[PDB]
Amino acid sequence: LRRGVAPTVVTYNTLIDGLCKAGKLDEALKLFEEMVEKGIKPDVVTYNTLIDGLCKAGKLDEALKLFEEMVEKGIKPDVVTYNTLIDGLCKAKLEALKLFEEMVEKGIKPDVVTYNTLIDGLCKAGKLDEALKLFEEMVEKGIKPDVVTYTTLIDGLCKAGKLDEALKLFEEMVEKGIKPDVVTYTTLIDGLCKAGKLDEALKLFEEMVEKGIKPDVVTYNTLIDGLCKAGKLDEALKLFEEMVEGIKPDVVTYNTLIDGLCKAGKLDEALKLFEEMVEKGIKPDVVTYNTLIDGLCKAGKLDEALKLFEEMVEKGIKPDVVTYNTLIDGLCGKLDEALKLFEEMVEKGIKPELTYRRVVESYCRAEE
RNA sequence: UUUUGGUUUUC
């Protein structure tokens, strides 16, 4: 902190980076003000850091202001600036493409990260043909696809249902000497599980280790989820144990099991898992409470579901739109209660398709 | 010092 050593702009950028990635955007922004007050000019990296923090914190519009502020100052937005906005716009919407042409008009060549950012956006938007189009184009520009590039297309193909094309594209990635990492293998493993081929997924998982590729928690979470969906609830509890025998399970690990257990009716074993993660200092997020609220709702235990909603609120976890979609749906026949909860998420500041669909079908069989 | 890929919830 302090410090007879005068901080550099590099010093504030690091702290601003750490603050933004800790959600602490308001605290990340007072640092911005402090540094001008000392006569230390925020640079392009300073704006790019705050812009990224704003996008990932869902304040896209606030980030677009910062882009305008920097331009007004003569602090030129660069390839990183555009890459940051393009991803931010993709993840919110697919505006990102006008920036991809705008950056070229500023003399900024798009790079491998730009192409990777847009290929993913196009896939997650159902525009896989468009994404494959960009893949061809970047090889034309002499941009060499990397492990992220090939992993983004393998994911999209799988999620579109083109698992064998995914398997084919992975094959050529080793031909070109691009070494797959744990994210690559997990993506194929997730794809095989989503496609009902659990043993082909374990075969690959073992091939991942024999290649010397160490799994992480996502890998096991992916594998555990495949086991819960497949109905292999015990083999997924085995995997949760074997996991430690040295990977630390995380919240998503617990969320996945808690969900498998809820959907099977094993509400007890779910609640004691929810108790174990807390005691183990693993904080339940919003999916944790969403999973249990739906579980208790589908089971006919709405009072306990509402009880759990309060407790989630009584603990600083903010309920999102899934929370309300679940509860709103859950009250089928507490007409006004359901309607009540809809206005409450408006006042809380949560953008509502399912929400509207559920309220109207509630209004109708109750023309309002 | 800043930007891109993989896992869980409202079926």
Numbering used by the authors: 42 to 44, 46 to 134, 136 to 137, 139 to 289, 291 to 377, 380 to 399, 401 to 414, 418 to 419
The authors write:
To verify the RNA selectivity, the dPPR proteins dPPR-U8N2 (in which N indicates any nucleotide) comprising 10 dPPR repeats with different 5th and 6th repeats with different PPR codes were constructed and purified to homogeneity. As observed in all four complex structures, four types of dPPR repeats recognize their corresponding targets by forming hydrogen bonds with the Watson–Crick faces of the nucleotides, which explains why PPR proteins bind ssRNAs instead of double stranded ones. For purine, Asn35 or Asp35 form one or two hydrogen bonds with adenine and guanine, respectively. These structures demonstrate how the amino acids asparagine and aspartate at the 35th position contribute to purine base selectivity.
Containing a tandem array of 2–30 repeats, pentatricopeptide repeat (PPR) proteins constitute one of the largest protein families in land plants. Each PPR repeat aligns to a single nucleotide of the RNA target in modular patterns, making these proteins suitable for the development of exciting new biotechnologies. A typical RNA-bound dPPR protein adopts a right-handed superhelical spiral structure, with its target ssRNA molecule sitting in the interior cavity and interacting with corresponding PPR repeats in a modular fashion.
